[PDB]
Each structure stands twice: as C-alpha cells, then as structure tokens.
Amino acid sequence: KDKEFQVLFVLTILTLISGTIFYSTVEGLRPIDALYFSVVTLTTVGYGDFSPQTDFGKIFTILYIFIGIGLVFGFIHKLAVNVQLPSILSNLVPR
Amino acid sequence: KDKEFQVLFVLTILTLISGTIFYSTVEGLRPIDALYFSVVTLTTVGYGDFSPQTDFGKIFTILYIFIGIGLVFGFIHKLAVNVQLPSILSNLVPR
Amino acid sequence: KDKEFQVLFVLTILTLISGTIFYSTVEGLRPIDALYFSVVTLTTVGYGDFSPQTDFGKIFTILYIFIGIGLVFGFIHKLAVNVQLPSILSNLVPR
Amino acid sequence: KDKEFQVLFVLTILTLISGTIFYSTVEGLRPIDALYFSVVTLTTVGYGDFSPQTDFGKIFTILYIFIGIGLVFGFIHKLAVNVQLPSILSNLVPR
Ligand SMILES: [K+]
Ligand SMILES: [K+]
Ligand SMILES: [K+]
Ligand SMILES: [K+]
Ligand SMILES: [K+]
C-alpha cells in the first residue's frame, strides 16, 4: 500500500509538473503561479484568478482536466485512507 | 468495457456539443469559448471567466449542471479505471 | 425507487427554495439570481459572479454548503443511476 | 457512529481553525473572511472573491487543499448518512 501510494504520488507530481511547464510557457505564468493554477484546476476548486487566455491554453485545459481529475482524486483518496486515517487512529492510543 | 467506455464517451461528446451550441447562440460566445465554458461547468471547476448573463442562460445552466454532472463524472471514472489504470500497469513491465 | 427518487427530488427543491429566499432577502438578489446562485454553490461549480457580501450571508453560506452538498449530490446520483441510465439503455433497443 | 461522527467533526473544526489563523495572519483577512474562505476552498466551491495573493499563501493553499479535502468530504458523507438520513426517515412516521 506504500507502493500503491507511491505510484499515485509520483504520477500526481508528474501531472502537476506538466501543467506548470505548459501554463508557464504558453500562458506566461510564473512557475509558482502555474503550479498553483494547476492544483486549483485539477482539484476543481477553480478560483479563477489565473484562467487561460489563449485558445491553445483553453484547449489544453479541457484535456488536462479530463486526464487529470481522475488521477488527482485517486491520490487524495489513497492519502486519506492509507496515510491520514491510520495516523489519526494512532494518536488515540499512548504507546 | 470498450463498449461501456464508448457509450459514455459518445454521450459526453453530445452533452458538450449541446452546451457549445446553446452558449454560442444564446449567450454569444465563440464556439471554442462555449465548449471550454461547458467543460469547466460540468467538471465543477467553475473558474467564472465566462458566466451566463441572460435569464434563459441562467435557467439553462441550472438544468445542464444537474443533467450533465452525473454523465461527465461517469465518463471520467470509466476513463481512469478502464483506460488510464491498465496503461500505467503496462508501463511497469517490459515486453 | 421512484419513491426514493421522489424524496430526494422534493428535499432538493426545498433546499434550493431555502437558499432562494435567504439570498434574495438578505443579500438582495433577484429570485432568479438567488436560485442560480444556490444551484452553483451546492454543486460546487462556484463561478463567483454573485458571492455573498454580508457577514450573515457569509455565515449562512458556510452552513448551507455543509448541509446542502450531501443532499444535492445524492439526488444527482439517484437521477443518473435510476433515471438517466435506464432511458439510455432503452434507446439501444427498438420496441 | 456518534463517535465516528464526533472524531471527524472535531478534525474538521481544527482544520478550518488552522486555515482561519493562517489566512487571517499571512494574507490579512478578517477572522470571518478567513473561515469563509477556508470553507469555500476545502469544499471546492471556490468562488474566488478572496484568493491568496502571496507566494507563501499560494504554497500553503496547495497543501491545505490536498490535506483538507479528504477530511472535509469525509465529514460531509458521515453527516449525510448518519445524521441527515435517519432524521428524514423519522419525519416520515408519527410517534
Ligand atoms: K468543485
Ligand atoms: K469549483
Ligand atoms: K470562480
Ligand atoms: K472571478
Ligand atoms: K469555482
């Protein structure tokens, strides 16, 4: 399960890296703004302070959402079930 | 399962086509902006750079969300489980 | 199952009615804008063209989201599984 | 189950408290605006009336979303299944 977590951890990192590079280059965002935008899109929060302005950006964002949501929320679920939950359970007991 | 994927693939395309046509016509968006808006609504990202301005648009959007979310996220789940996952698993092995 | 659908249908209507009344009165929106805002909040699309400006509105919105999301998305799931799916299946066969 | 609900209730409160403090201090929001922003981020509504302006805020928000979504939506699910549902069922019967 640490190796199920590890795979989706890595995939998530690669996915956010892809969006950092694309949105920094094509749409002109700072590396940090691209990452932050990528995270806020794939988690569907979607604040809208940085939306894409070019048609290639609009198109890319359509695909990135469809390819990216399933992966991101799979990581979030494994994180919550396999990491967050046990550590909570462990706090409820003194060793 | 390729035929389960195919059905929801097609339905999704038809759903986004319906929103492209409606938002291009009634709300006056470019074909590409309508599609992009339709995708960002049904995935619930909801950036808010293009929201509907007319009452018919507001009303249509209420129904489109309720009818459209269940379908879109069904496609996303089948895509992630039946397409993305196996291809990941296959990369972990050299043929 | 028509009676499982009916219950969550009604509850959803009452939930959106509650937000229509509150956001029309306290925040000053048109009936139609309040409803549209209520739908876009509880489905988490959250465009942000109409956000609440008063502290009572901010507070109310915190509770409305927590009480309202679980219900809305339960309706959406039952709608997609018990209504949308069978009607799709039925189209694939000529009577 | 009241004690499953209680744990996730408390955790949720602590999670929103953490975001209230951070966004009030670092980003300069009013206590009430920080809380409201924290709720609208972790439920992914993401209106975007208050987004973070500093790089430390941007970074913090990336982690807060990943750590916070799994917990918030776990509370929402338990609330809807273990509290909201039974009380609805009970209304359908006169004692
Ligand atoms: K969302
Ligand atoms: K959203
Ligand atoms: K927004
Ligand atoms: K906005
Ligand atoms: K949003």
Side-chain angles (χ1 to χ4, degrees), chain A residues 40 43-47, chain B residues 40 43-47, chain C residues 40 43-47, chain D residues 40 43-47:
Chain A
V40 172
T43 57
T44 75
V45 185
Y47 291 122
Chain B
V40 172
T43 57
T44 75
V45 185
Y47 291 122
Chain C
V40 172
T43 57
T44 75
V45 185
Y47 291 122
Chain D
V40 172
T43 57
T44 75
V45 185
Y47 291 122

Side-chain angles (χ1 to χ4, degrees), chain A residues 2 29 56 71 79 82 95:
Chain A
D2 312 353
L29 300 181
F56 254 165
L71 189 182
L79 170 70
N82 297 338
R95 295 176 176 188

Side-chain angles (χ1 to χ4, degrees), chain C residues 8 12 69-79:
Chain C
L8 294 174
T12 298
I69 280 178
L71 189 182
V72 159
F73 277 94
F75 171 70
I76 292 174
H77 169 275
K78 224 62 162 141
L79 170 70

Side-chain angles (χ1 to χ4, degrees), chain C residues 10 22 30 39 49 53 60 68 71 81-82 85-86 88 93-94:
Chain C
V10 175
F22 175 92
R30 286 198 301 148
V39 170
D49 40 342
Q53 298 186 298
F60 176 92
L71 189 182
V81 165
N82 297 338
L85 177 89
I88 293 174
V93 302

